[PDB]
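Hi W.,

Here's what went into the run:
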Amino acid sequence: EFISSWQNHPIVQVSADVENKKTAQLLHADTPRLVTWDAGLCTSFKIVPIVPAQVPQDVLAYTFFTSSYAIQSPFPEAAVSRIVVHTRWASNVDFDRDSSVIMAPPTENNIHLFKQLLNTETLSVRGANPLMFRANVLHMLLEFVLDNLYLNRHTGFSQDHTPFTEGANLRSLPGPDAEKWYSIMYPTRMGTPNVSKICNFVASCVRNRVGRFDRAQMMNGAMSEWVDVFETSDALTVSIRGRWMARLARMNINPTEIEWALTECAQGYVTVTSPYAPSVNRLMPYRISNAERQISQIIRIMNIGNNATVIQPVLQDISVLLQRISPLQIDPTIISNTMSTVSESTTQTLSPASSILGKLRPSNSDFSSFRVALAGWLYNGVVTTVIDDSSYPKDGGSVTSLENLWDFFILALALPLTTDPCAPVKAFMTLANMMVGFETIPMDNQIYTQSRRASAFSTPHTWPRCFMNIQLISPIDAPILRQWAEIIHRYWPNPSQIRYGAPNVFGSANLFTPPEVLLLPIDHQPANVTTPTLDFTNELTNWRARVCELMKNLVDNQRYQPGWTQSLVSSMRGTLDKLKLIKSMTPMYLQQLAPVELAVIAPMLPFPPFQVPYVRLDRDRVPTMVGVTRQSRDTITQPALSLSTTNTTVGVPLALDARAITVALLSGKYPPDLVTNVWYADAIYPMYADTEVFSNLQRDMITCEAVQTLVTLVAQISETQYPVDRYLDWIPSLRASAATAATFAEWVNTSMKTAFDLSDMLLEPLLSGDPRMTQLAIQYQQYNGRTFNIIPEMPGSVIADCVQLTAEVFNHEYNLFGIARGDIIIGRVQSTHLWSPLAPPPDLVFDRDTPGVHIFGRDCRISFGMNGAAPMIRDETGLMVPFEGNWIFPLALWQMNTRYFNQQFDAWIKTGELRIRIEMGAYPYMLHYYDPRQYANAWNLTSAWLEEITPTSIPSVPFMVPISSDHDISSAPAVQYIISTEYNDRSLFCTNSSSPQTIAGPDKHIPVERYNILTNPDAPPTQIQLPEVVDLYNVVTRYAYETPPITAVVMGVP
Amino acid sequence: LVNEHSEAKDEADEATKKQAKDTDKSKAQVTYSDTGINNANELSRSGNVDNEGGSNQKPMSTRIAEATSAIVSKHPA
Amino acid sequence: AYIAVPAVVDSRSSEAIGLLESFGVDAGADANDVSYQDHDYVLDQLQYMLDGYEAGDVIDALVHKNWLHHSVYCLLPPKSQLLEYWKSNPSAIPDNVDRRLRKRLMLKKDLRKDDEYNQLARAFKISDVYAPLISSTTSPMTMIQNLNQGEIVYTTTDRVIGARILLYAPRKYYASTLSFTMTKCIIPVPHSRFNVGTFPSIATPKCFVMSGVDIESIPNEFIKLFYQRVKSVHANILNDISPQIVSDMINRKRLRKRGASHVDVYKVDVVDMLFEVVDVADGLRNVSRKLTMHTVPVCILEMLGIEIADYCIRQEDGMLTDWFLLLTMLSDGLTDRRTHCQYLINPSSVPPDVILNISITGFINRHTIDVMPDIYDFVKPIGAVLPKGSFKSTIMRVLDSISILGIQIMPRAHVVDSDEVGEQMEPTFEQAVMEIYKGIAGVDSLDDLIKWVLNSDLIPHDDRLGQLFQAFLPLAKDLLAPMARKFYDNSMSEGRLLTFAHADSELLNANYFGHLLRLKIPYITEVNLMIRKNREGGELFQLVLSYLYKMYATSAQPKWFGSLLRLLICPWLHMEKLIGEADPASTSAEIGWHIPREDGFIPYVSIRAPRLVIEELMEKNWGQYHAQVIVVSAKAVIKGNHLPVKLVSRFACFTLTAKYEMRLGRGAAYSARLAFRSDLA
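Here's what came out:
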């Protein structure tokens, strides 16, 4: 029943997204589209006709005008012409950034541009909410900048064959119908037969500044490296592209340092070559500062925060790569062969060999879990590999059981390879549990007694006193267990370090450790031969030997031995002896080769290593918390102060299988004839033909760029802690809340993703939380309380700077963007004069300090007239006044009482002597031209505008401006109601451009300062007049650099 | 309109192919391509660039065609 | 010069079809300038490779292939078979072999128990003779590099990619290999100035790539994945070029009917349509929105005249015009070009988001897509599911008035309305739904029910609608389902029909037989109801009914409605361009059920195709399928299995629906087999 319901499921949007695919993002990220080439004109401003020229006419014969001879003109030949922004209206690009900003001529409505952001509540299609004008303008400027990120392309030239120029070189545009461009690029090339405006302007210009200006021809017979040309353009886009190219050039590298980096990162196992001769200036933008890498690393950490499903596939990928590169493979039969030789009697009820072989079951697939355990060493910051619960004995076990003895053996060998700091305590408590009743020790309290599950001891606070202080364990009452504790303290592996990477190209994303440094939980000792042979001088070999000796002492104890038959004792000790001297090559591999492989692999990871120091037994330095922050508290501004109380803990444990790791430790063999320097040279060679790392570097650059853009943009509509300029305060804006900021940030993120062609997700972790106080930091804390924090000092950002530059320019050229500044005055003006309403005569306007005015505020209230008395309204001073004179309203005051005010004031405004000034700040505007010789009344337009005002939306202000003429005309009355407050008519370009002069109506010659290079013989060619006046004819640098793939220039030696 | 590096590589292949034919063998014993030297920066003269260093993606005559067609004026109405 | 396009390319076939101008590149004079490389076998090798490696690394390795450099694999037998091969015909042994082994192989003795040849064989490996080898433990990058330089690459496995595969020693020796894909026998091409291949390579700084940025528009799955990965890894080192650029670089110095072969009719060209919603409510204009239409076939655009200008889409009545309905009906929805969300059309002239005049701007993408929905194995009756308020009457009327080639496709008699099941009962389903209200506490009339369930904004309260469903579902599942079952069972008897429904669960619970299609619309269906006047129980009741059906539907993604109309129309419209001139007597055919006692024959399928195609069709085993015909208004029933679609052709566009009737007397149930009674000529 035309109630306009069921129009609400419209534009109201959706933001909630299910994001289980963090793994896909982490394993591979889309590369930004950095380099793009533009072959067209580096301009974004278009001159358009508005009113066709008065041709033919009864005054001048048609033979005078230039158009009658079909001569192309650099400028429109029209009665009225104006300037309109139209990004890339002449460009010819290869990749589209799909962020165009286009308006229509002011005679055509342009309201839809300013209602694009937050007018989801606006009903009318012709209206928009003034309070989001600032946000809409900021979005428009951001898209304006983004659409212009292109590199100018060098096309080609041709010498002139006509006397119009002194043999200049003219650049040829690509694409079809290139004829029209030659008349637009070079205004000075036109002939000057007439006295008209265009001909006069051209004749008053310099003649040698046209076409090609300078070039750098390096190689005879190849493309010129770059050129400089005089051609139509705008200073703003030229500056933007210049700084963009400057950033790209700062990011450049050359092949020689590339081969140096690749040689370094491969540890000398791979040799690559680069050419040595005059090149052609390729462009390979891959070098970025360490700060950007740290920012990207922190963002990446915050994604995988406290989630295991996101990190586990990374570990499997690393395991697969390691298995692909490593020379170590499982010996199928070593354990069975060595255990089949022990001697035993067939009359025994038990057989140690049976039990051990039953527990081992070497399924050959155990090296996968061994490899993931190895990979865990690189990410102890977020992932803490631990032994699964199921590996421990079910009820706690007992030393009298053979099965429990073998379980203890498996756990004892498996534990030292995990990244869990609390591992040694669990190793000790594993035996302590089995030894209960048999042999006792003092524990801390009644909860964590000697009979707790060994896996329960997980934090430094639970470390038993007796374990840290050996003397508490009685050498008489507990010999075996004291011996075990001494073994743990004296023979646990010592962590070490190793250098890796190529910092001068790849940078370094290390946070809590020095660059190039990679920590290990095992001491590394480089091998000095390339033909390895079996050796027993290893940490892990000593560990296994000590464990076997401890078991042997346990069996032979006189308090425990008499429970066993002598034959069983002999078999057991023989089995332990066999296990002691097994010929497993894995400890050698871990001590000598594995660190080299990790160092080789690490720089090529998609997720660079993130480590915290390994502490052997210093309970004071065990890390207990790793946190990141993305916000700041209420009043705290300095990140070093709010970091402690605004961080979110990050980390997650991962479970492994002790059986598998023990099998790996026991059954490793090398290929029958191994020569390491050949094996690795053969294996590593393919894997350094991968260019994913450089792509990751570019992605990292864009991440920080976007973060800085977000903070700078948000610092405009709200209040933040960072210093920032402010040029758009005069544009009205609402009192922003958290929700408004979140919506604005979502829009910014969408725009940036679209512009650079990113299909994955960007900035999302920052969207959660309030974006008005963003800050990036990270810290971790030891057990003793000493804390360490890292605050990456934010680098620059070209896009934010360019956006601010365009905003600063907008503070002067707001007319060109279809925006009028100031206020409006509503009042009847009837006369035959021809002044433009956009440039009203000074006497018609008034302001707050004009004598005899009335200012009105929040207390609008009206007393109706009675018995002929005039109605009255209350001034802000408490005076009662009639409906006449000059008033001043804040606009919201009219918005909140539209209907009442219309009904009360329209008659007096139309016919009486009432004039009102509405305070707007800024507003879109519309033009309606009219014939001066005909009667014209503008009351209908103003009436519609007034009546369509809504407490949420207003429509574009309509103006009625006369049409300029180039010959004598009659006059006719005109009734005007709306005039602007100050000058707002900077958009106009020329009037009667094809005629000798303008007789009636507003007059305007070609803006001379827009062509300062041509008009001023003394100006240097490279002068610009920003931010006050944008020029329309500049010196443009066009490049011809190559962007070859990495493998095309650097080829390895097989 | 082929890249100078491509032509240097493409010309190398053809020379190697005719070497094999001249010595009635499938695989040439002496080759001008796939050598140890990383001669990536090599350039060969090609018809892609003119004498002004511009791109020859549009011929000289045609470029002159559009250039001086924009200056012509016709007999008046 | 190398150019990669996002489509499968073959040396012989893709040339006959205008592949380049299937995209938009003119290429006027051939002059033997463009050349094509066969990449189909490469795609097959990629699919085979996917069984042992990740997609990403395989694609990454394959990118570095130089397609202008000629090289090929050389499959070898297993070692033990290789030696015994060398024993026979000892004239192929390479000179690199150990002289002791060569001398022993020519011994001409059986070598069964030599006991010295044994040791020599044991301590022998293929790599000792052939330098570049692949042994199933080799990264694809290594293979690509090996093919990049050198002509012959030796391998001991068939799971390789990049080039053709030749055979070493005769097939008898290869026992582990069974695939017949492209393994050339023991029995054993230049480059044109331009070369076109499906894959894009970075082996050269200027191997060009087609536009290829419309990743979603690529039909094939594998090519789509390949292009996506390539641009997601090497976005900044690609040379993107547009069709106009290709046309220029082909026709630079020169500019200043596909011959005769079998022609497929289910390959159509589609384009993206760009336009806007200009409002001219006054003398001025507006640019309110900018939108895009996705899958618009070119044949339709050329059929009904579409230029680029200021089109108005409303008539004096106030509703939309027919051609605009058809155009929006053939596409895959709309999309706003500022915010990339989906867009829906307000049909009515109600202030919020009105569309009265539009202006076309241009056409961006162009590619050829298959039209066969691929769920069309057997010729079966078709059931389409559309929500209430989907212009059913208008669509039916528009479809009925299509008499393209004397056949009048999709007649009104061959379609059954959704509501047809409703009036089978003397009290229809609708009044039972109306009377549901008596089962709800606190509701005394249908009007009370309406004001109770809606919240003054025509929105169900999302809870009260719960009990509405609670009461309504037993009615449907206990009354409508059985009568629908009988209705569909009888309907199948008269022949193939087009069936419309409101929720697919209706057809599922009725045990419907035939192809099932769920289709959606690029409009707001709910608003289509309350404007449609002359309703029985009030429009709001219709809204509630539509909500009930939407809740009744299953969980399945409905395709765009255009996927049906495209198959219904475009093949016929294309074929008219070929058959529009020939004698209909020769270029016509008929398929129907044969019954011996002039002679009994009832039509089943109508076939139109060129003479050669019909002649090829004439010799097919049409007698293999049998049915039982009973009796002008005859009707039959098929036993066994239905007719497979490929038996008709990928050519010879046919009729989707048929009605059973006997052409000029006791009721009989004899038998039937179908025969190719098409014609003599």
